[PDB]
Design a binder for this molecule. Structure first.
Ligand SMILES: OC[C@H]1O[C@H](Sc2cccc(I)c2)[C@H](O)[C@@H](n2cc(-c3cc(F)c(F)c(F)c3)nn2)[C@H]1O
Ligand SMILES: [Cl-]
Length: 138
């Protein structure tokens, strides 16, 4: 397994048609997972599965600018299960990140950070065993 938190450089940032794949297994009794697509210290796209927010499972997405979080976008469709292997695919499209989990579309997140070629890091954190993190062009 890879170390978590994991810092994956995205050389030259992201671009439409770029597909980022994260493979791992959710730990038993997991509480949270986070993907952070970052432009320097800003977080262009935070993707945050929460396994127990008031005894509900929810995916919270947001952007952090100058250390301030913005308006949350929440998705109650929750495809993760404690103890189980998963695949998160983040496809960069011209106007949003498109996320599929286990080959099923999950959500889209409109680009708030617009300098895509400056979003040059993906951080992976939380309650997972991380198997691989990679990217390719489709
Ligand atoms: O809006 C989104 C944010 O919400 C709250 S901050 C807040 C409070 C009130 C109103 C508003 I607007 C925002 C969270 O604390 C933020 N978070 C989560 C993680 C995190 C770290 C890790 F190391 C993990 F492994 C992990 F899974 C998650 N770091 N930061 C982020 O999720
Ligand atoms: Cl959290």
């Amino acid at each position: 397994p890879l170390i978590v938190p994991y810092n994956l450089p995205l050389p030259g940032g992201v671009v439409p048609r770029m597909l980022i794949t994260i493979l791992g297994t959710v730990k038993p009794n997991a509480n949270r997972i986070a993907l952070d697509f970052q432009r320097g210290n800003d977080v262009a796209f935070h993707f945050n599965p929460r396994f127990n927010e008031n005894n509900r499972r929810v995916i919270v997405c947001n952007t952090k600018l100058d250390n301030n979080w913005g308006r949350e976008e929440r998705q109650s469709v929750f495809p993760f299960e404690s103890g189980k292997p998963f695949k998160i695919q983040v496809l960069v499209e011209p106007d949003h990140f498109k996320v599929a989990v286990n080959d099923a579309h999950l959500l889209q997140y409109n680009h708030r950070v617009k300098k895509l070629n400056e979003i040059s890091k993906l951080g992976i954190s939380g309650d997972i065993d991380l198997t691989s993190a990679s990217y390719t062009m489709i």
